[PDB]
Amino acid sequence: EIYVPQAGDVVIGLIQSVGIMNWFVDINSPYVAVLSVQDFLGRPFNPAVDDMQSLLKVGDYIKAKVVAFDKTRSPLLTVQGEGLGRIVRGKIVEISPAKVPRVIGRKMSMLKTLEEKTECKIFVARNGRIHLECPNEDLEAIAVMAIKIIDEEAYTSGLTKRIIKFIEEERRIRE
């Protein structure tokens, strides 16, 4: 069981391949989403003086919203938005689209936690991708295994506090 797009789902996308007017993005869904130079520029595409499939190369991750599905079921992304767009530095972590909620916590509780304990900036993408951002390599590694562990956790009895102690003992040796 995996992720299925829904007009509104902000997602972390991986530019698979580039075309002429569009970029095809890996959305961690059965169907490949599309993002056009039209939507990206808020201006009709102009192959002559304009065109530059160098605004997004292959390998780029992009924070984008799903707006609808074209007459073939392919989801149509948009870069126009809050903080939507290409992602610079940081880490992208893939998780089971299923374990996404138990990483945010009741009222983003479980989430605020990690951001607070590791000081890392975190955005949990409803599609199973996560962008970790913080000024520290060792510190982020922790925050990764932090998400890694929560995901793999088969016995979730008391995990929030049980995880906070993990991070603490982690940074206690990582420095």
Side-chain angles (χ1 to χ4, degrees):
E1 202 54 43
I2 307 182
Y3 178 57
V4 173
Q6 296 181 303
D9 292 334
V10 176
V11 179
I12 297 269
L14 179 57
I15 311 303
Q16 281 196 178
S17 39
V18 181
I20 302 293
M21 311 173 282
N22 316 273
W23 287 282
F24 304 107
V25 301
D26 178 338
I27 212 59
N28 210 72
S29 163
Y31 284 64
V32 178
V34 182
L35 169 72
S36 75
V37 191
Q38 298 278 311
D39 183 292
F40 190 88
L41 280 166
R43 174 259 289 337
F45 181 46
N46 189 43
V49 166
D50 175 61
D51 170 300
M52 249 312 232
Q53 301 314 264
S54 102
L55 287 178
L56 294 182
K57 318 198 79 183
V58 165
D60 280 358
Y61 277 94
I62 67 171
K63 207 202 193 83
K65 276 186 179 67
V66 155
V67 177
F69 301 60
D70 78 54
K71 322 307 176 181
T72 204
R73 272 177 264 94
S74 293
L76 300 188
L77 311 189
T78 162
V79 177
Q80 300 307 309
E82 278 55 59
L84 294 169
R86 182 163 82 52
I87 287 168
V88 202
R89 80 295 70 172
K91 293 167 193 187
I92 308 299
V93 166
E94 271 145 52
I95 79 182
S96 303
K99 280 58 176 288
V100 182
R102 83 115 139 293
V103 178
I104 281 78
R106 293 188 283 185
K107 277 185 180 181
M108 292 165 267
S109 54
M110 210 310 158
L111 192 169
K112 292 185 175 65
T113 305
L114 308 96
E115 290 189 299
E116 202 170 60
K117 232 302 174 68
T118 36
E119 306 169 6
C120 273
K121 173 68 76 297
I122 298 173
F123 172 72
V124 186
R126 195 157 173 176
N127 78 321
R129 297 259 181 64
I130 292 178
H131 177 231
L132 303 166
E133 187 180 304
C134 174
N136 202 301
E137 202 67 292
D138 289 68
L139 207 172
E140 289 195 306
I142 297 178
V144 185
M145 35 213 325
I147 271 104
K148 232 70 197 298
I149 265 166
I150 301 180
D151 190 25
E152 300 164 49
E153 198 59 7
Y155 291 100
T156 166
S157 50
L159 189 67
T160 302
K161 285 299 178 296
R162 200 205 320 176
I163 202 93
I164 304 185
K165 234 69 241 304
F166 165 94
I167 299 178
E168 209 176 69
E169 174 60 24
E170 197 68 81
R171 43 192 316 184
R172 177 207 165 66
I173 340 171
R174 279 304 178 70
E175 32 188 286

